[PDB]
Structure 1
Amino acid sequence: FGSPSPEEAQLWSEAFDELLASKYGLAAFRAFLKSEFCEENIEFWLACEDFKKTKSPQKLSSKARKIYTDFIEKEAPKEINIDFQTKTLIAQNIQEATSGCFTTAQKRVYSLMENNSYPRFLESEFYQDLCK
């Protein structure tokens, strides 16, 4: 099981958060981003949302490295589309990383989906079929 009602899925149009609230809605949106080769934005955002809540200064420093290499380091496997400014802003901060290390970039990437991939998800046939 796991399926959403059409009414439930229609709510995902209200805003980007109504989708992300939805466990399934999230699964669908990822699938979409895969189809257009920019799922790295959503993974990274999810990666930040956990990092934000990290407690111990060990994990708070070794996850700090995990994220950097995966998304920020140039030619990184999952390099996200952001500025040299912001990328360097991070690079320096990572020695003694705190919760608010990536939160600058997190916000951009969210906007970068909000204003771009999210609207397209809504104009997709997979979604519109789901609203029936």
Structure 2
Amino acid sequence: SPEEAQLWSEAFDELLASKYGLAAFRAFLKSEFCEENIEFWLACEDFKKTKSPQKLSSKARKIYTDFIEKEAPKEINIDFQTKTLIAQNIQEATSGCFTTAQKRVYSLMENNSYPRFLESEFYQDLCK
């Protein structure tokens, strides 16, 4: 509907909340090749709720090699200081190792990608 959508303009969590919209903003982040940041957060959102130490030391090596490691395929745009930080914690990983950049990457979208999505024509033609 055109109201469920107009609800998302309010704030960035309203867009994440809906399911349909989460697939389209990705389809737009793809259209600006900055999808590696959106996939990472959902890698962190599934990481934060993980329980067993086995799954905590192995999943932690999936996301690193992907988004962090030097010349990583989906290397998200972040510093060397946060990459040095998360480089010493993975050994005995815990729920709050990544959050350092997770919050940086969320800020990287709320302040750049998301606003442009609300100005995008695919969003606005959905709002009628």
Q: Where on the TM-score scale, by shorter chain, does this alignment land: which range?
A: over 0.9
Q: Distance in 2 between matches of 1:51 and 1:45?
A: 9
Q: How big is the shift at 1:58?
A: 0.3
Q: Distance in 1 between matches of 2:26 and 2:67?
A: 17
Distance in 2 (CA, whole Å) between partners of 1:77 and 1:35 is 18
User: How many angstroms apart in 2 are the aligned matches of 1:58 and 1:105?
Assistant: 23
Quote the Cα distance in structure 2 between the aligned partners of 1:55 and 1:119.
35
What's the offset of the Cα at 1:33? Answer: 0.1
Shift of 1:107: 0.2
Aligned-pair CA distance for 1:75: 0.5
Q: Which of structure 1's runs of 4+ aligned residues deviate more than 4 A?
A: none
Distance of 2:47 and 2:115 partners within structure 1? 27
Offset at 1:29?
Answer: 0.3
Name the residue aligned to 1:63: 59
The Cα of 1:65 is off from its aligned counterpart by: 0.4
Paired with 1:56 and 1:18, the residues of 2 have a C-alpha distance of 31
Decide which of 85, 99, 103 is 1:89's aligned counterpart: 85
Structure 1 residue 86, shift from structure 2 partner: 0.1
- What CA deviation, in whole Å up to 9, does each residue of 1:44-67 have, x standing for no partner? 000000000110000011001000
| Inter-partner Cα distance in structure 1 for 2:116 and 2:20 | 17
- CA distance in 2: counterparts of 1:9 and 1:24, whole angstroms: 10
Which of 21, 25, 32 does residue 25 from structure 1 map onto?
Answer: 21
What is the Cα deviation at residue 19 of structure 1? 0.4
Residue 101 of structure 1 deviates from its aligned partner by 0.9
In 1, distance between residues paired with 2:84 and 2:66?
A: 15
How far residue 76 of structure 1 moved from its aligned partner, in angstroms, is 0.3
Shift of 1:74: 0.9
Deviation of the 1:110 alpha carbon: 0.2
Which 5+ residue runs of structure 1 have no aligned equivalent? none
- State the distance in 2 between where 1:127 and 1:68 align: 32
Among candidates 2, 5, 11, match of residue 7 of structure 2: 11
Q: Distance in 2 between matches of 1:27 and 1:80?
A: 19
